[PDB]
Design a protein around this ligand. Structure first.
Ligand SMILES: *[C@@H]1O[C@H](CO)[C@@H](O[C@@H]2O[C@H](CO)[C@@H](O[C@@H]3O[C@H](CO[C@H]4O[C@H](CO)[C@@H](O)[C@H](O)[C@@H]4O)[C@@H](O)[C@H](O[C@H]4O[C@H](CO)[C@@H](O)[C@H](O)[C@@H]4O)[C@@H]3O)[C@H](O)[C@H]2NC(C)=O)[C@H](O)[C@H]1NC(C)=O
Ligand SMILES: *[C@@H]1O[C@H](CO)[C@@H](O[C@@H]2O[C@H](CO)[C@@H](O[C@@H]3O[C@H](CO[C@H]4O[C@H](CO)[C@@H](O)[C@H](O)[C@@H]4O)[C@@H](O)[C@H](O[C@H]4O[C@H](CO)[C@@H](O)[C@H](O)[C@@H]4O)[C@@H]3O)[C@H](O)[C@H]2NC(C)=O)[C@H](O)[C@H]1NC(C)=O
Ligand SMILES: *[C@@H]1O[C@H](CO)[C@@H](O[C@@H]2O[C@H](CO)[C@@H](O[C@@H]3O[C@H](CO)[C@@H](O)[C@H](O)[C@@H]3O)[C@H](O)[C@H]2NC(C)=O)[C@H](O)[C@H]1NC(C)=O
Ligand SMILES: *[C@@H]1O[C@H](CO)[C@@H](O[C@@H]2O[C@H](CO)[C@@H](O[C@@H]3O[C@H](CO)[C@@H](O)[C@H](O)[C@@H]3O)[C@H](O)[C@H]2NC(C)=O)[C@H](O)[C@H]1NC(C)=O
Ligand SMILES: *[C@@H]1O[C@H](CO)[C@@H](O[C@@H]2O[C@H](CO)[C@@H](O)[C@H](O)[C@H]2NC(C)=O)[C@H](O)[C@H]1NC(C)=O
Ligand SMILES: *[C@@H]1O[C@H](CO)[C@@H](O[C@@H]2O[C@H](CO)[C@@H](O)[C@H](O)[C@H]2NC(C)=O)[C@H](O)[C@H]1NC(C)=O
Ligand SMILES: *[C@@H]1O[C@H](CO)[C@@H](O[C@@H]2O[C@H](CO)[C@@H](O)[C@H](O)[C@H]2NC(C)=O)[C@H](O)[C@H]1NC(C)=O
Ligand SMILES: *[C@@H]1O[C@H](CO)[C@@H](O[C@@H]2O[C@H](CO)[C@@H](O)[C@H](O)[C@H]2NC(C)=O)[C@H](O)[C@H]1NC(C)=O
Lengths: 420, 420
DNA sequence: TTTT
DNA sequence: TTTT
C-alpha cells in the first residue's frame, strides 16, 4: 500500500515482580505501570482497551497487599479521564459465573462504555487478548491483564508503540470487530464488511519507519472465525516466523502444550511442535525453549517438553534446549492467588520478532481470541536486539532451571519438576 | 467384488539365526528355508520372484561358512525347476556398481528370465521388495532377501499363504508391473493399463476364507509413481491400521527413522511418528516399539526413539514403550558381513495385522518400492493371535533391552546405546 | 491467569 | 541389508 511516514517508535516495557532482581543491569526498560500511566496522562481523544478480566483494587481479590497500590492508581486515572471527554471503550470477556465487576461498575459510573463479549456462545472460547489504543496514535500490546498482580507480582513483556497512527488504527480495526461482535445477540457475519478488512498481512506487511530505520510490521489475530480476508492468522504468522529462521529461535512462553486441551477427549495438535522440529533438524537452527512453571501449570506438559529435549544429538545436528523459568515466592506472596509467574509470550529469531498475547496451545489458536505483532527490521540492532537481550538475561538467570532439576531447590511450587 | 472361495491358509514362517534360542517353546513355525523348499518342490507351472539382491553361495560373499549350505541348496533347487518347464521370472534391482551376479548368471544358464530393474533412473530409489508367487496359487511375502544369511544369520518374519489364487494373482499384478517397467528404456505411464488395475483396496478389501473363518485381506504397494488407481499406498494402509487401533499397537521393525534420510540436506518426515503419538495420546492405546540395533544402524535414530519414549505419563495416559532387539554375535559370526540382525517388519493391533517388506523411513514410502499385506479377521485367535504371540516372545526375550542399557552388556555392537 |  |  502506502508507507506510514510516522515517527514510529517502540519501547519494550516489562513488569518485574518484587523479589526478582536480575544482577545484570542495563535493562533500562520502563515498567508496564509507568507506560500505562504515561499513556493515560497523554490521552485526550480516545482510548480502546481489550482485556481478559479486570481486577485492580484489593477488594476484587479480598486481600490486603499494599503491592496493589499501583494498580489502584491506574484505576483512579481511568476514572479521571472519562469525564474529560475521552471516549473510553472497554471489551471484557463475559465471566462464566456471576463474578462481580466492581471496577467495571466504577468505570460505568465514570462514563466509560463496557461491552462484555460472550465468546463461549459464538466460538466456544474466551477473549484473552490484551491491547490498548490511545488517541489512535499510540498503542500497547503484551501479556498484561487489567490486574494489579500483572503490575507487581506477575513477570511480563509488552511493547508500547508511540507515534504510529497507521499501526494503531490497524489494531483498532480488531478492537472494533470485538466491539461489534459482542454488543447483544450478534453472530459472526459470513463476510465481514469492508470496514474491518485490512491490507497489511504477512504477504504485504506495512512499511513503517521504526526509530528512524525502515521496518516491516504487521498484526495477526485469532480465532479464524473473527479474521477478515486481509488479516493473517496468528498461527500462520508464528509458523512463518519459525520457518524463516536460519540461525536461532528463542521462545519465551508461559504455557506450551501441543494439544487442543481442556477439550476432552484428548486431542493432538502438533502444529508448532513439528515447526520447531523441522527448524532444528532440517536446518542448523539453535532453538531455545523458555517455559514458566507455577502451581496452575498442567503436569501433562512436562512429558511433551521432554519429547522436545531429546532431539539434541551431534549426528542430528539438533540443538533443542528447554528451560523452566520459575519466579520464587516467599510465605507472604504465596497467599496471593494467581500471583507469582512469568507470563511473557514472545519469540525472537535472528531476523524477526514476535510479540503475542496468547500461550502456545490449540485453544489459543483455534478458539480463544488473540493478537500478535510481527516486526522485521533490516540491519543490526533495533527492537529485535533489545528483545534478544531480554531473553538472554532471562535464560542465564538463576530463575531458569533444566527439566531435571529437583522441585525442592526451586523457590516456588513447580508441577513440572520431579521431587529428588 | 466377488468372494474368493479358496481354501486359503496362512503360515507364519520365520528364520531363527544360530545362537538365538527362545526358551519359551510352542513357536512351531516352519523356517523360511523349509517353506521355500516346499514351494519350489511343488512348483510345476510358474514362479515369480521379486528380490532386492541375490547372494546365496559362499563365493558371492568370499567367505567359508558352512552355514551357507541351506542357501546353496535353495539355489540348486532353483536351477532344477527351470528345465522342467516352469516359467521362472526374476526381478532384481540394478546394483549401482558392476557387482558380479553369479547366481543370476547360473539361473540364466538354467533357463530363467532375469529382468534387472534400474529404479534409480525412474523413481530415484531401489527395488527393495521381497515376495514370491508360485503357480499363481501360493505366495510368500516377508523380510527375506535371496541371501543365505537371511536364512541362517538374519532373524526374519514372513507369511506363506497357500491355496489363495485370487490374492496370489493380485500380488502378480504388482510383479508384472515391475516386470514391464524394468525391461529396457521404459518409464512410468501416465495411466497404467487396465491389466495392472486392482479392485481390492483398503476401501473394499477382498473377502477370503482364511483357515475356515472369513477374513478381509488386501495388498498395498510403494512407491506412489508405480501404484495404479485401485492399489492402496503402503503408507496409507499403515496409517489406517495405526488409526483404527483401540487397545494396543505392537510394531517390530528393523529401522525407524522419521526422516526422508540419505537425502541431504536433512528432511523431516513425521507421518508415522504423529500417527503413533495420536494413537497413544488421543486414545488409550498401548504402543510397543521393537527396533533392531546392529553395526550399520544410523546413530541419529536413537534421539528420535527417545523423543517417542518421553510420552509416558499417567496424566497423559500415554504408554509408549521402546525396546531394541539385538541378536548376539560371537567372534566367528562377527566376521560375516551384514549377518547378525533382526530384520522383521510387521505391526499387529487388537483387530488387524500388517506384514511388510520395507523399514519405516521416508525413502521406503516415497521412493523405494515395497509391498505389504493387511489382514483383518473377526473373532479371537487366527493369524493375528500367532503374530501377537511371536511379538510377545520377542519382546520378553533376553535379546531386547531398554534404550538406557549400556552398550557393553549387549552381545553385538550397538550404535544406539551409550557406553557405561 | 485461562484452569479448577 | 539398503548404507557406506
Ligand atoms: C526507540 O526510541 C524509543 C523512544 O526514545 C526508545 O525508548 C527509550 O528507551 C530507553 C532505553 O530503553 C529508555 O531509557 C531508559 O528508561 C528506563 C525507564 O525509564 C524510567 O526510569 C526511571 C525509573 O525509576 C525514572 O526515574 C525515569 O524518569 C523513567 O521514567 C530507565 O530505567 C533507564 O535507565 C536505566 O538503564 C540505563 C541503561 O539503559 C542506565 O544507564 C541507567 O543508570 C538506569 O539503570 C533508561 O533511562 C527511554 O525511557 C525510552 N523512551 C521512553 C519515552 O520511554 C527505544 O529504546 C528506541 N529503540 C532502540 C532500539 O533504540
Ligand atoms: C492355518 O492352517 C495352516 C495349514 O495347516 C497352519 O499351518 C500349520 O501351522 C502349524 C502350527 O504352526 C505347523 O505345525 C508346526 O510345524 C513346525 C515346523 O514344521 C516342521 O517341523 C519339524 C522341524 O524339524 C519338521 O520335522 C516337520 O516335518 C515340519 O516340516 C513344527 O516345528 C511344530 O512343532 C513344534 O511346535 C509344536 C507346538 O506348536 C510342539 O508341540 C512340537 O513338539 C514342536 O515343538 C508344528 O508341528 C504346520 O506345519 C503348518 N502347516 C504347514 C503346511 O506348514 C496354520 O497354523 C493355521 N493357522 C491357524 C491360526 O490355525
Ligand atoms: C511522539 O511525538 C510527540 C510529538 O512529536 C513527541 O513529543 C515531543 O517530545 C520531545 C522530547 O521530549 C519534546 O521536546 C522537548 O521540548 C521541550 C519544550 O516543550 C524542551 O524543553 C525539551 O528540552 C525537549 O526538547 C517535544 O516538545 C514534544 N512535542 C510535543 C508536541 O509534545 C513524543 O516524544 C513522541 N513519542 C516519544 C515516545 O518520543
Ligand atoms: C492346498 O491344497 C492342496 C490340495 O487341496 C492340499 O493338498 C492336500 O493335502 C492333504 C493333507 O496333506 C492331503 O491329504 C493326504 O492324502 C494322502 C493320500 O494322498 C493321505 O495318505 C494322507 O493321510 C492325507 O489324508 C491331500 O492328498 C492333498 N491333496 C493334493 C491334491 O495334493 C494342501 O495341503 C493345501 N495346502 C496346505 C498348506 O495344506
Ligand atoms: C475496599 O476496601 C473495603 C472492603 O474491604 C471497603 O472500604 C470502604 O471504603 C469506603 C470509602 O472510604 C468507606 O466509606 C467504607 O466504610 C469502607 N468499608 C469498610 C471499611 O468496611 C470498600 O469496599 C473498598 N474501599 C474503597 C476505598 O474502595
Ligand atoms: C557433541 O556432543 C557431545 C556430547 O557427548 C558434546 O560434548 C560435550 O557436550 C557438553 C554439553 O552437551 C559440553 O558442556 C562439553 O563442553 C562438550 N565437550 C566437548 C569435548 O565438546 C560436544 O560438544 C558436541 N559437539 C558439538 C556441539 O559440536
Ligand atoms: C565357489 O568356490 C570356489 C571359489 O572359492 C570355486 O570352486 C571351484 O569349483 C569347481 C567345481 O567343483 C572346480 O572345478 C574348481 O576347480 C573350483 N575352484 C577352486 C577350488 O579354486 C568356485 O568358484 C565355486 N565352487 C562351486 C562348486 O560353485
Ligand atoms: C503412574 O505412574 C507411576 C510412575 O511414577 C507408576 O508407578 C510405578 O511405575 C512402575 C513403572 O513405571 C511400575 O513398575 C510400578 O509397579 C508402579 N508402582 C505403582 C505403585 O503403581 C504407576 O504404575 C502409574 N499408574 C498406572 C500405570 O496406572
Amino acid at each position: 500500500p502506502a508507507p506510514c511516514y510516522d515517527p514510529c517508535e517502540a519501547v519494550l516495557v516489562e513488569s518485574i515482580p518484587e523479589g526478582l532482581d536480575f544482577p545484570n543491569a542495563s535493562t533500562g526498560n520502563p515498567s508496564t505501570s509507568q507506560a500505562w500511566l504515561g499513556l493515560l496522562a497523554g490521552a485526550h481523544s480516545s482510548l480502546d482497551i481489550a482485556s481478559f478480566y479486570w481486577t485492580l483494587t484489593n477488594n476484587d481479590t479480598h486481600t490486603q497487599e499494599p503491592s496493589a497500590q499501583q494498580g489502584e492508581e491506574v484505576l483512579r486515572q481511568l476514572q479521571t479521564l472519562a469525564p474529560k471527554g475521552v471516549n473510553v471503550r472497554i471489551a471484557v470477556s463475559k465471566p462464566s459465573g456471576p463474578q462481580p465487576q466492581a471496577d467495571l461498575q466504577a468505570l460505568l459510573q465514570s462514563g466509560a462504555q463496557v461491552r462484555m463479549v460472550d465468546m463461549q456462545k459464538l466460538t466456544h472460547g474466551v477473549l484473552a487478548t490484551k491491547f490498548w489504543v490511545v488517541d489512535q496514535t499510540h498503542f500497547y500490546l503484551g501479556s498484561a491483564n487489567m490486574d494489579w498482580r500483572s503490575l507487581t507480582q506477575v513477570k511480563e513483556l509488552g511493547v508500547v508503540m508511540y507515534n504510529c497512527s497507521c499501526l494503531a488504527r490497524d489494531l483498532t480495526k480488531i478492537f472494533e470487530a470485538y466491539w461489534f461482535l459482542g454488543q447483544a445477540g450478534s453472530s459472526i457475519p459470513s463476510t465481514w464488511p469492508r470496514f474491518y478488512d485490512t491490507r497489511y498481512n504477512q504477504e504485504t506487511p506495512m512499511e513503517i519507519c521504526l526509530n528512524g530505520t525502515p521496518a516491516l510490521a504487521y498484526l495477526a489475530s485469532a480465532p479464524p472465525p473473527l479474521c477478515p480476508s486481509g488479516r493473517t492468522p496468528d498461527l500462520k504468522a508464528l509458523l512463518n516466523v519459525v520457518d524463516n529462521a536460519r540461525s536461532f529461535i528463542y521462545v519465551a512462553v508461559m504455557n506450551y502444550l501441543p494439544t487442543l486441551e481442556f477439550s476432552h477427549p484428548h486431542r493432538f495438535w502438533p502444529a508448532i511442535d513439528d515447526g520447531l522440529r523441522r527448524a532444528t533438524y532440517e536446518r542448523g537452527v539453535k532453538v531455545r525453549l523458555l517455559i514458566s512453571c507455577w502451581g496452575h501449570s498442567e503436569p501433562s506438559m512436562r512429558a511433551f517438553l521432554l519429547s522436545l529435549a531429546a532431539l539434541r544429538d551431534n549426528h542430528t545436528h539438533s540443538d533443542i534446549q528447554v528451560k523452566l523459568f520459575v519466579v520464587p515466592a516467599d510465605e507472604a506472596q504465596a497467599r496471593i492467588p494467581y500471583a507469582r509467574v512469568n507470563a511473557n509470550k514472545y519469540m525472537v529469531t535472528e531476523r524477526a520478532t514476535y510479540i503475542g498475547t496468547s500461550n502456545w496451545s490449540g485453544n489459543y489458536f483455534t478458539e480463544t481470541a488473540g493478537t500478535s505483532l510481527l516486526v522485521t527490521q533490516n540491519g543490526r540492532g533495533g527492537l529485535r536486539s533489545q528483545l534478544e537481550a531480554i531473553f538472554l538475561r532471562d535464560w542465564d538467570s538463576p530463575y531458569s532451571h533444566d527439566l531435571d532439576t529437583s522441585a525442592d531447590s526451586v523457590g516456588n511450587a513447580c508441577r513440572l519438576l520431579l521431587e529428588v
